[PDB]
Design a protein around this ligand. Structure first.
Ligand SMILES: [Mg+2]
Length: 285
């Protein structure tokens, strides 16, 4: 009965486990963590310098420990369970991988999530996971990822998994068509998130890009389920993001969106997503 767009309030760059409850306490229903790779091996949650102004850039955790901790906060019945914590984005830093490393990196991430987050299908964490890849050309990561989960008898866990192919930013930015095709190549026919905001080498075209993605998401045969804007920390820009029609707001300060959502002119149109808002479902106005 609620006609309002569910919004994902994504805590940006939450790479230390100590930071998780703090960001959820600020009101995030989601968080984002940067997954570093040593070869094909996902190793740390760690962003590194430079990072957003006003942020310490070098908080980190071992990937497995981070995933295990996410499990704690997202397993019903767990002492640490937060029913408000419904999704996380893994910003997979595969950008330096040689081609041979890409598929195994997907397998490795799948294995990590399987073991540490989903506990091999044994009362795993319930949050949705967005695999964010920085290259549409890394679709074999997704193929490798899916293979592992299916081969291990946990294809059903793919219900919890979504994808965001975002980049590369050189030689040129990806078109939507190119992105859509990359999903097709990954065997991905839904659970598609699109991220925007991080590139602005052409503000006119970036304005255009976002609107194009919004139009695409809302088109009859659209492939994008959710659009999230990296990042937004001010009330004004938070409102602007909501107003242009994004589904998710990546932010250093989740408390900002919480406040905006409570405001007149916002509380009638937008609301904080809950677990029952399928992140893979395109919002129909
Ligand atoms: Mg990141």
């Amino acid at each position: 009965a609620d006609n309002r767009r569910p919004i994902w309030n994504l805590a940006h760059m939450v790479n230390a486990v100590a930071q998780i409850p703090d960001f959820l306490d600020l009101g995030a229903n989601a968080l984002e963590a940067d997954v570093t790779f040593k070869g094909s091996v996902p190793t740390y949650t760690y962003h590194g310098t430079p990072c957003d102004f006003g942020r310490d850039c070098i908080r980190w955790e071992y990937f497995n420990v981070f995933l295990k901790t996410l499990r704690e906060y997202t397993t019903p019945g767990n002492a640490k369970y937060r029913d408000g914590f419904i999704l996380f984005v893994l910003d997979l830093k595969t950008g330096s991988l040689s081609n041979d490393q890409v598929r195994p990196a997907g397998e490795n991430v799948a294995k990590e999530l399987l073991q540490n987050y989903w506990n091999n299908g044994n009362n795993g964490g319930r949050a949705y996971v967005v695999l964010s890849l920085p290259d549409i050309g890394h679709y074999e990561f997704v193929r490798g990822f899916k293979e592992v989960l299916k081969k291990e008898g946990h294809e059903d866990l793919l219900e919890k998994v979504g994808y965001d192919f975002s980049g590369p930013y050189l030689p040129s930015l990806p078109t939507l068509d190119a992105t859509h095709e990359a999903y097709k190549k990954a065997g991905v026919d839904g659970h598609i998130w699109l991220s925007d905001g991080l590139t602005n080498f052409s503000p006119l075209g970036d304005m255009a890009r976002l609107k194009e993605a919004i139009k695409s998401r809302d088109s009859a045969n659209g492939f994008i389920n959710k659009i999230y804007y990296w990042s937004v920390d001010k009330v004004s820009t938070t409102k602007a993001a909501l107003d242009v029609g994004v589904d998710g707001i990546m932010t250093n300060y989740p408390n900002v969106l919480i406040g905006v959502l409570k405001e007149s002119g916002y509380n009638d149109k937008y609301r904080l997503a809950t677990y029952d808002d399928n992140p893979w479902e395109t919002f129909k106005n």
